[PDB]
């Protein structure tokens, strides 16, 4: 991985040593060439995972996530380029640096071979992210969103640090391969029940699980565009990636300890989906859409079946590209009228016919139209959840109906009806804004033709 | 004060801890504690106004009373064993009275109420001395008798200090109090691990010193005592915001900064001894430190508070501070986690 | 009231540069920034990255495992063996508790 990491560490000197008129071109050119090199990880001709050293190693779970991270860096640079044009030079280079730093840590976070190394990297991402939301956010509420984001994570993460230390003080190591090949069944004593929650609540908060999710709609609604893109596409998947990795050493307590969290996800996802029907803020509607998709990911990981893992991995990558595409699209309006209210601007298909096509395709991905990989996830999670118990189809049936309503209601409200003709500042879509959407959508279409690449570990 | 006084007074301040640290006999260890107490007093009260006089008085009566209690332990022990050093056979109550007295000298809660006020009434550079160099002498005594210390007293003091330091610092708009409560909380970590691994108490002391030194130096750059005073740094020394923020996160124990290492290794070693409950509460209340450190970061580097007209003159002028030590201590106190295995052992 | 700038106004990005691409206020820096994104983004990554992924062979043994299953399903059918045994590990090697 040191050939994906070291060149990425060089985008930091390149950011600072480049000319004022070359920073945005140079960095965004080399970010693409770094996401090309990360494709080497996909050269997996065998059933043995790639182990590069004692530190890093790539699996079929950590490779899609690694690549999605590297590909997202150039996307976020282009997204952040028009709302930073009024800042002096050092602020732009300081913004570019915080985004690169978040790509370097995220790649190391998914490639780490030891839990303690995962934890530290998994905590370091708060710094660049807290700086982004707070320094470059727009409203006065960005200060309260940084606190909610920082201390939901930290409160959950202290018990995880405790539990990880107990694992090593007993097993001798935190290496993920060794803990896999030497795992011993846990007793059902009241101490291991707490060890289970200690190892899980950190990741269940980051998903977020229903109940403890109020940090996400606060963070999204106030972060700059690249703050929402990375949050909705990668940082939520730190929770999912962690739970998959550490749940191997927690058996058999997941057969009963998971009930409270399968129930909060299955019921919680209906509560969040139905919120999107009455949400007056467009950036808020998407953020609750994320909460209700991650609910299925939580539910499917808690049952540990080959299908459920397979559906969750596909839904992790699919949601990564889709939610990011939605946030970019909502930003495109926001960078014209500087209002997040969904009903303020209407009939935008009349003056942005092409941007209205991307809206439709993003919206169709969100409501999981076959054959997109958004459905494959939803469909394979449903299949596994049905086998787990047959009445989960009742709640997933409902959530599928609501998911259609708020997806199309989102499209019908903003793109149709009459134009809000007083908006004389609706400039034609930039070539930059359209490229940003094509870069989200083309990979999503390509991954549908080759789903094998995002089946995860079980398949 | 004239150069003769500084040479005499600053030498004596330095001399005290070196006598306590190099001494085999307990009475010579006590003597070094007296040198520090006596010689710091003129430094604290140099500006001579109503507040530094109260500060130098509260400090004297606290540290003199604690000295007498320590001396009683040293003397009851000479009665019991005819020797000038603590032995495995030293009475249990003799050791506990030494612990409470030394914690009274360190500022550990619940014997802590003096420290935030004294730090408040004195100039910044003497707060630096008081919150750093002055802690080594009492701590060096404690590390010499760690096989003997009752852990129940030590953990109740450490748990108290971590809680009171967190709660106290959460309510403060004065920077000097925020530094005192910061000190109280960190001493809780040094003390909690003392009877188990005294080497980790020295690691946590050293990392705290190199974080607390530049932080004071940063406030001494513009002589900024309040949260509103430090909020003007963007319009006074904006070059300082990058390293003030990291040092504050580093003082907060956030990864991947050097200040995570002390908490992380202390927790690790506490649970090697099965000190699960204490370790969990300690780490859970260290979260409160990060909140009011975060609030400071909000006011200085992540937002721009309103500035005043007269600050434009300040910009026309040229500063000769900080010195080369600030930069060296700022980098080492934040970017040295990848050297963790070389610091613990 | 306090000294404070008034809020900057609503500028048209196309007013001065009708070919504004969205990247920069300077036309020459602006076009070369659009060109770079299209070249490294579409001509290089999407084209070659897609090609390199289509010619990764025997991906995760999806191809070897089929070739091997056909070899086994043949060998076992002619030699009269079961297509697949109920037990995975031979019962000989497993010493059960008594």
């Amino acid at each position: 991985m040191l050939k994906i990491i070291l060149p990425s560490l060089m985008l930091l000197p390149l950011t600072w040593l480049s000319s004022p008129k070359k920073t945005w071109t140079n960095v965004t050119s080399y970010s693409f060439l770094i996401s090309l090199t990360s494709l080497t990880l996909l050269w997996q001709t065998d059933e043995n995972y790639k182990n590069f050293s004692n530190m890093f190693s790539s699996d079929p779970l950590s490779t899609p996530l690694i690549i999605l991270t590297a590909w997202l860096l150039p996307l976020m640079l282009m997204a952040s380029q028009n709302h930073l044009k009024k800042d002096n030079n050092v602020l732009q280079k300081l913004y570019i640096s915080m985004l690169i730093s978040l790509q370097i840590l995220l790649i190391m976070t998914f490639s780490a071979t030891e839990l303690i190394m995962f934890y530290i990297l998994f905590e370091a991402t708060l710094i660049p992210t807290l700086i982004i939301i707070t320094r470059w956010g727009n409203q006065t509420e960005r200060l309260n969103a940084g606190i909610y984001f920082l201390f939901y994570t930290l409160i959950g993460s202290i018990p995880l640090l405790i539990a990880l230390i107990l694992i090593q003080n007993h097993v001798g190591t935190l290496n993920l391969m060794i803990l896999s090949f030497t795992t011993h069944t846990l007793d059902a004593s009241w101490s291991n029940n707490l060890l289970w929650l200690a190892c899980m609540m950190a990741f269940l908060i980051k998903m977020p699980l229903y109940g403890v999710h109020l940090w996400l709609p606060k963070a999204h609604v106030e972060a700059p565009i690249a703050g929402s893109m990375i949050l909705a596409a990668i940082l939520l998947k730190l929770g999912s990636y962690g739970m998959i990795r550490i749940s191997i050493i927690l058996d058999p307590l997941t057969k009963y300890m998971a009930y409270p969290f399968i129930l909060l996800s299955l019921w919680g996802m209906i509560m969040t989906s139905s919120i999107c029907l009455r949400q007056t803020d467009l950036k808020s509607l998407i953020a609750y859409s994320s909460v209700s998709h991650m609910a299925l990911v939580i539910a499917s990981i808690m049952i540990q079946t080959p299908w459920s893992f397979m559906g969750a991995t596909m839904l992790m990558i699919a949601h990564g590209l889709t939610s990011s595409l939605l946030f970019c699209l909502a930003n495109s309006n926001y960078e014209r009228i500087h209002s997040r209210t969904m009903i303020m601007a209407r009939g935008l298909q009349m003056v942005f016919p092409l941007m209205a096509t991307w809206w439709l395709m993003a919206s169709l991905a969100n409501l999981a139209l076959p054959p997109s990989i958004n459905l494959m996830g939803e469909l394979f999670i449903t299949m596994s959840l049905f086998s787990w118990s047959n009445f989960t189809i009742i709640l997933m049936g409902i959530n599928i109906i609501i998911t259609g309503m708020y997806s199309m209601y989102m499209i019908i409200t903003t793109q149709r009806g009459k134009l809000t003709n007083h908006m004389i500042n609706l400039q034609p879509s930039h070539t930059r804004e359209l490229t940003l959407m094509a870069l989200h959508m083309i990979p999503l279409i390509l991954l549908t033709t080759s789903p094998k690449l995002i089946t995860g570990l079980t398949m | 004060m004239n150069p003769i006084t500084l040479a005499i007074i600053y030498f004596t301040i330095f001399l005290g801890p070196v006598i306590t640290m190099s001494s085999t006999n307990l009475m010579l260890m006590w003597v070094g504690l007296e040198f520090s107490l006596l010689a710091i007093i003129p430094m604290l009260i140099n500006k001579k106004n109503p507040r530094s006089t109260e500060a130098a008085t509260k400090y004297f009566v606290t540290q003199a009373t604690a000295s007498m209690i320590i001396l009683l332990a040293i003397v009851l022990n000479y009665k019991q064993l005819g020797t000038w050093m603590f032995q495995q056979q030293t009475n249990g109550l003799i050791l506990n009275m030494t612990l409470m007295a030394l914690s009274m000298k360190l500022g550990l809660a619940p014997f802590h109420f003096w420290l935030p006020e004294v730090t408040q009434g004195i100039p910044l550079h003497m707060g630096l001395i008081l919150l750093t160099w002055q802690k080594i002498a009492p701590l060096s005594i404690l590390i010499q008798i760690y096989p003997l210390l009752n852990s129940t007293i030590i953990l109740m003091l450490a748990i108290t200090s971590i809680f009171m330091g967190a709660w106290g610092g959460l309510n403060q708009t004065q920077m000097r109090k925020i530094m005192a409560y910061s000190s109280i909380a960190h001493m809780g970590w040094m003390l909690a691990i003392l009877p188990y691994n005294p080497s980790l108490t020295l690691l946590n002391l050293m990392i705290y010193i190199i974080l607390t030194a530049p932080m004071f130096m940063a406030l001494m750059l513009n002589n900024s005592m309040t949260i509103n005073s430090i909020s003007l740094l963007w319009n006074k020394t904006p070059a300082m915001l990058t390293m003030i923020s990291l040092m504050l996160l580093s003082l907060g124990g956030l990864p991947p900064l050097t200040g995570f290492l002390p908490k992380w290794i202390i927790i690790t070693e506490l649970m090697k001894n099965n000190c699960l409950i204490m370790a969990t509460l300690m780490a859970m209340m260290a979260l409160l430190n990060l909140f009011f450190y975060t609030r400071l970061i909000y006011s200085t580097s992540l937002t721009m508070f309103p500035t005043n007209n007269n600050s434009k003159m300040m910009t026309h002028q040229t500063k000769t501070k900080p010195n080369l030590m600030f930069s060296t201590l700022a980098i080492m106190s934040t970017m040295t986690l990848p050297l963790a295995p070389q610091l613990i052992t | 009231q306090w000294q404070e700038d008034p809020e900057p106004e609503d500028e048209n990005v196309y007013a001065k540069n009708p070919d504004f691409h969205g990247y920069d206020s300077d036309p020459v820096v602006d076009v070369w920034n659009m060109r770079a994104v299209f070249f490294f983004g579409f001509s290089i990554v999407l084209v070659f990255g897609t090609t390199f992924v289509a010619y990764v062979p025997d991906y995760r043994m999806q191809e070897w495992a089929r070739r091997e299953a056909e070899r086994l399903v043949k060998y076992r059918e002619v030699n009269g063996l079961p297509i697949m045994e109920s037990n995975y590990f031979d019962p000989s090697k497993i010493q059960l508790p008594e």
């Binding site: 470059w136 956010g137 727009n138 409203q139 006065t140 960005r142 500087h338 | 959460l170 309510n171 403060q172 708009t173 309040t226 949260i227 509103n228 909020s231 009011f292 006011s299 937002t303 721009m304 508070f305 309103p306 | 306090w2 809020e7 900057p8």
Partner: peptide
Amino acid sequence: ARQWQPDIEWAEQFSGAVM
């Protein structure tokens, strides 16, 4: 719109003796 930056009312909440 423009980025919100603290005003006089916001800063006066750190101006007291306690927080």
